[PDB]
Amino acid sequence: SALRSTKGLVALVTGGASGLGRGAAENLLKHGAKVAILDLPSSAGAEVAKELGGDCIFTPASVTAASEVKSALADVKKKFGRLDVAVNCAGIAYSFKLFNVKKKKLCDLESVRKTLDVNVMGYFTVAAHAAELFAENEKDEMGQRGVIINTASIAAFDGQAGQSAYSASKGAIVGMTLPLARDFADDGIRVVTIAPGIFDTPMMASFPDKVRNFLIGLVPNPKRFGVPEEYGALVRHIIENRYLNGEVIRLDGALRMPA
Amino acid sequence: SALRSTKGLVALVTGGASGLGRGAAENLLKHGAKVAILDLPSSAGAEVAKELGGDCIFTPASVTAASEVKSALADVKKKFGRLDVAVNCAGIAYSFKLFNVKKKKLCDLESVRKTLDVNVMGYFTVAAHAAELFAENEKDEMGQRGVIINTASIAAFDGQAGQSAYSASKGAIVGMTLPLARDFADDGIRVVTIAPGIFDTPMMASFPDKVRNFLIGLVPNPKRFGVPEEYGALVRHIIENRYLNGEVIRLDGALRMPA
Amino acid sequence: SALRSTKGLVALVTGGASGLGRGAAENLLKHGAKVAILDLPSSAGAEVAKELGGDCIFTPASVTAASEVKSALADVKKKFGRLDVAVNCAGIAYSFKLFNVKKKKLCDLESVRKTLDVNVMGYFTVAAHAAELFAENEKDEMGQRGVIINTASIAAFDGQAGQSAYSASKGAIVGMTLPLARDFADDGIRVVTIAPGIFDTPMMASFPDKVRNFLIGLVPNPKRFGVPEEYGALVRHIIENRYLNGEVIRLDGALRMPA
Amino acid sequence: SALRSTKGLVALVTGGASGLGRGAAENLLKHGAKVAILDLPSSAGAEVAKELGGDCIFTPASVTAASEVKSALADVKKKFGRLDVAVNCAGIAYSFKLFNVKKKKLCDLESVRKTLDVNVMGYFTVAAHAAELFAENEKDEMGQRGVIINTASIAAFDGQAGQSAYSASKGAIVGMTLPLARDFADDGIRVVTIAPGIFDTPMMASFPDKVRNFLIGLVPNPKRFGVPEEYGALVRHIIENRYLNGEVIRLDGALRMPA
Ligand SMILES: NC(=O)c1ccc[n+]([C@@H]2O[C@H](COP(=O)([O-])OP(=O)(O)OC[C@H]3O[C@@H](n4cnc5c(N)ncnc54)[C@H](O)[C@@H]3O)[C@@H](O)[C@H]2O)c1
Ligand SMILES: NC(=O)c1ccc[n+]([C@@H]2O[C@H](COP(=O)([O-])OP(=O)(O)OC[C@H]3O[C@@H](n4cnc5c(N)ncnc54)[C@H](O)[C@@H]3O)[C@@H](O)[C@H]2O)c1
Ligand SMILES: NC(=O)c1ccc[n+]([C@@H]2O[C@H](COP(=O)([O-])OP(=O)(O)OC[C@H]3O[C@@H](n4cnc5c(N)ncnc54)[C@H](O)[C@@H]3O)[C@@H](O)[C@H]2O)c1
Ligand SMILES: NC(=O)c1ccc[n+]([C@@H]2O[C@H](COP(=O)([O-])OP(=O)(O)OC[C@H]3O[C@@H](n4cnc5c(N)ncnc54)[C@H](O)[C@@H]3O)[C@@H](O)[C@H]2O)c1
Prior knowledge:
259 residues; binds nicotinamide-adenine-dinucleotide; homotetramer; alpha/beta
C-alpha cells in the first residue's frame, strides 16, 4: 500500500491537554502512535497524559519560549528516540474591535501581540525545532522524514467582527503552509494545515446556551459543532497519505462565518 | 466513535473503469463497500468489475445522458438496495489555445462545449440522480442520507497555457460545491470536492518520458505523481469523517502548476 | 505615465443593452472610448446605442451562436477599425435545487446546460473572436494588443442554496482567467475577471421590496446594492493599468452570501 | 457620479518615503490629495516630502511604536484638519529557512518576530489609530468616514522557499481584511488589501542583474516588474470606488511565484 500505518510513529501535539490537541493525541494513541503532549504547566497535561497511558508523555513548555520548546523536544527524543509528526495546535482567541467608534476607545494592541506570539510565533518555534529532530531521521520508503500539521481556522477566511487579531494570526498560518512545504520539499518534511470550523472544546465553554444554539444554527451540515475526534481523524489521515502537502483543509460542516 | 466504517456502504463511482475512479472503487471495496462503477460501454468496465470481485458491478452509461444515468442508478438500487455515496470522477482533458496568434487560427469551440458537457453537465446529472436515491434513505445517527464527492483539479486554481477549457470545467466543479452542500444541508447530503494534482493514470499515458520527468520535477514533495490509491484513501476519509462538507481539498504534493 | 487613457480605445461589451454591461458601456463612452454593445435582437440594444451617441453602435448577436459573434466582431472592425477591449458581461441566472427532496422531483437539467451555454460558452466564443481581432493590432508601448475583462460573480465563491448551476458557470469563469492570461501572455492580451456582488440591475428587478431589503441588509458596507457605474469604473481601471492580469476582483461591499 | 474625486482627501501613507508607499503618495498628490508620509527618521522622508511639494508632510514614526503613530496622526490632524485614507505600506522582507537541514542549524526565530512586528503589528497599530481619526468625521453621502488600504503580497498565496515568515505576515494581512471591514461596516470605514507581485522598488535593489532577469522571466504579462505608479493608481481607485470593500486584489502581471 502507498498509505502507511500510524503504528509506531512518534507525534508531538502542542496544546494537547485540551480540546482539539487532546482529540489528536487520543486518535493517534488509539492507532498505535507514541504521543508527547506539549502544554502549559498550568494546564492539566500531566493528568491527561496519565489517563492516556504509557505511550503518552506530558512535556511542559510554553510555545512562546524557544528554550522551553527545545527542551520539551529533547525530552521527546530521550523518551521515544525520534519524532515523526508535529501537530501545531496551541492557540488563544480574543474578541475585540480595534477602535470602539461609539465610545471612542482604542483597543489594547498588546492583545494583538499576544495573539500573534502564541498563535504564530509558537507555530514557527515548534516547526523549527521539530524540523531539527526530523533531520535526524533517515528518509523512509517515500523519501519522508516528518510531517508538520498546523491548526489554522476558518477565521482565516471568514473572519467576523471582533476577530481581526485572531483572523490575522490564522491567516498567517495559512500563508506559511506552502513556503514551508517548499522549504522542506527535498528534505522530506511535509507541511499541511487544517482550518477547523466551530468545535466543541473549552475554547467555546464560556458561551451560554443561547450563543451555542445560535452558532449551531449557522452550521449547514452536520448541524452541530465538530467533535475533537473528527479533527484527530483528519490529522491522522494527513499523517497516513503522503500526497497531502502544502494545502489548507477546511473542516467545518460547510460553515461560512457570517457578518 | 464519530467516524463510521465504510463496510456495507454502497458507492457509485463514475469513471470507475480507469485511473482515479478505479482507485476509489478499489479502496472502498477493500474496506467493505459495495461499489458500482459507472463508465462507458467502450471502456474496460466489465472486465475491471470482474477483477474487483463480487461486491463490484459495472453499470454502463454516459454521464452526458440523463436517461442512462437514471437507468444505471436504478440498477445500483436493484442490486444493492440503496445508495450511500456518489463519486463524480469521469472527465476528459483537452489542450488548446482559443486563438493561435502566430498562425491566425481559431480553436474548435465545440471542444469547449464537450469539455463542459462531460466534466460539468455529467457531474450535475449524476448529482441530481444520486440525490434522488439518497432521498429514499432514512437519516442515520449523524442526520445524513448520502455524500457526493466531486473530482475537480488543481487546474481550477493553477490553470496552465492551453488549459482554459479544462480549467473552466474544473473551476465550475469548485463553484458548485458550496451551494450544493447548502442545497442539501437539511436533507443530510454532503458535497465535498477533491482537487488532484498530477496522478499516474491513463489520462497522462500519452506523454513521453521527457514530459513525465519534467512534470515530476515540478512536484515539490513527494517528488512523484500521485498514485490512485491516495485519491481513493481521501475519498474514503470524506465518506467516514462527516464534518467535511462544502470544501475543496487539494491533493497534489504541494504542486503549483507554473506558466 | 505608465497608466494609459481610455480615449480612442475600441471596446466591445456583451450584454451591453442592460445593467452592468450598459454601465461599462456608458463609463467607457464617457471617457472617450468607442463602444460596440453586443446583445440580443430582443434586447433594447438599438435604443440604448442611439441614446449613447455616435461613438456607440449596437451589434446584434447571441453569444451562444459563434457565427453571429463572428459577424458582430467583423462589424466592429468595419465601423471602428480595430478592437482594444472585450468585456464579457452577458449572462443569465436561474434558481433551482437539483432534486427537491421533500416533493421527490428532479430539476430540469437543461436549465444547467443553458446556464453553462450562455454564461461560459459565450465567454469562450467572445474571447476567441476578440483575440482574433486583437492579433491584428500592433503591440503598443507596453507590448499589449488587447484586454479581455470577464464578469463572474461572488456566487463563484459564496454560492447559495438554489444557485448551484449559476455558481458553477461563474466558477468556470474564475477558473479560465489565469490559463487564458497565460495563453496570451506573450501575445500581449491580458485577461482579468470582476466578481460583482449584488448590483441594482434588471436581473434583480423581479424581487419584491421585502427581498430587496433583505439583500441590502446583508451587504456590510456601503449598505446598498452596487450601482452599474461602479462596475464600469472598475472595468475602466483594468483597461488603464496594465499590471492587472490573471486576477479575479470581488466588487461587493464586503458581502459574503450566507447560507 | 458614484465615484468621488481624490481632490482634497487627506491620506496617510506609511512607508511613504520609498517604493510603493512613495508611489501611492505621488499618485494621490497629483490628483489633489493632501498626503502625509509616515516613515522612519532614518529614511529620506523629509527630502521626499520636500520633493513632493506643499501638499505633502513627513511625519516621522515607527509603526511598531503606538505612541509615535498616535503622535504622527495628531500631526496630520493639526496640519490638514481630518483624515480620509490610511495606506498601510511599510514592511520588511527576510529570506531564511527555519532549519537548514544540510548544515543542522536553526534559524534566528527573532527574525520571524520582527517580520510580524513591522508587517502585522504595525498595520494593526496604524489601523486602530486611523480609525480613531475617522470616527471624528461626519458620514459623507455614501455613509463613509474613511478607508484603510493594506499592502499584503502575493507571497500570502504563492510563498516561495525561504519566505515562510514573510508569507505568514502577508497572510496575516489577508486574514485581517474581512473582519476589519465587518468591524467598521456600520461606521463607514472600508478595509481593502492589495497583493502586489514584484515591483521595482528599493526592496529589490540588492538583487544582481541575473536575479532580476530571472524574476522578470517569471512574470507572464506585462513581462516586467510593476512600477510604483501602477500600485498608486490602484490605491486611488479603491479610494474613489466605494463598493470595493473586504477584498484582496492581486496586482502582479499574472505572476504565480513558483517552487
Ligand atoms: N475549537 C474551535 O472551535 C476552533 C476553531 C478554529 C480553530 N481552532 C484552533 O484550534 C486550536 C485548538 O483549539 P482548542 O479548541 O483545542 O482550544 P483549547 O482552549 O481547548 O486548547 C488550547 C490549548 O492550548 C494551550 N496553550 C495556550 N497557550 C499556550 C502556550 N503558550 N504554550 C503551550 N500551550 C499553550 C492551552 O493550555 C490549551 O490546552 C487553536 O489553535 C485554535 O485557534 C479552534
Ligand atoms: N490524472 C490526473 O493527473 C488528474 C489530475 C487532475 C484532475 N483529474 C481528474 O480526475 C478525474 C479522473 O481522471 P483519470 O485520471 O482517472 O482519467 P482516466 O482517463 O484514467 O479515467 C477517466 C474515465 O472516465 C470515463 N469517462 C469519460 N467520459 C465518460 C462519459 N461520458 N461517461 C462515463 N464515463 C466517462 C472514461 O471511460 C475513463 O475510464 C477526471 O475528472 C480528471 O479531470 C485527473
Ligand atoms: N447584477 C448582479 O447583481 C450580478 C451579480 C454578480 C454577477 N453578475 C453578472 O453580471 C453580468 C451582467 O448582469 P446584469 O445585472 O447586467 O444582468 P442584466 O439582465 O441586466 O443584463 C444581461 C444582459 O445579457 C443579455 N444576454 C442574455 N443572453 C444573451 C445572449 N445569448 N447573447 C447576448 N446577450 C445576451 C441580455 O439581453 C441582457 O441585456 C452577468 O454575467 C451576471 O451573471 C450580476
Ligand atoms: N516591492 C515588491 O516587489 C513588493 C511586492 C510584494 C509586496 N510588497 C509590499 O509592499 C510594501 C512596500 O514595500 P516597498 O517595495 O515599497 O519597499 P521599500 O523598502 O522600498 O519601502 C518600505 C519602506 O518602509 C519603511 N519602514 C520600514 N520599517 C518601518 C517602520 N518600523 N516604521 C515606519 N516605516 C518603516 C522603510 O523606511 C521604507 O521606506 C511592503 O509592505 C512590502 O511587503 C512589495
